[PDB]
Amino acid sequence: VLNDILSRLDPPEAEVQIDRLITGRLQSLQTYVTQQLIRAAEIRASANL
Amino acid sequence: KTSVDCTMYICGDSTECSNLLLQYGSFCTQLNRALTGIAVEQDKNTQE
């Protein structure tokens, strides 16, 4: 939970913890976007058929 | 039809490594599901 970190720690370590969280969530989002792109390519092939 | 054991590949026979990997959530499940989907797609391709 971002709010817990931002309430329990000061910037010098809060920003490291938030760096870790941002890295994880950004990797998750990029994976999701790649999956959506692939599935949309499949669905567009089906739509053209 | 390749299939990769995510937890065994990343964290081969290490309980501590598995506990650390659990911090990353469902990534392993995503990869395994994707590979299973590919395998099923291949069998569907051959069948059709």
From Swiss-Prot, chain B:
Disulfide topology: 6-28, 11-17
Source organism, top-level taxon: Viruses
Effect of residue 32 to K: In strain: Omicron/BA.1, Omicron/BA.2, Omicron/BA.2.12.1, Omicron/BA.2.75, Omicron/BA.4, Omicron/BA.5, Omicron/BQ.1.1, Omicron/XBB.1.5, Omicron/EG.5.1
Functional note: Precursor of the fusion protein processed in the biosynthesis of the S protein and the formation of virus particle. Mediates fusion of the virion and cellular membranes by functioning as a class I viral fusion protein. Contains two viral fusion peptides that are unmasked after cleavage. The S2/S2' cleavage occurs during virus entry at the cell membrane by host TMPRSS2 or during endocytosis by host CSTL.
Record protein name field: Spike protein S2
Organism lineage string: Viruses, Riboviria, Orthornavirae, Pisuviricota, Pisoniviricetes
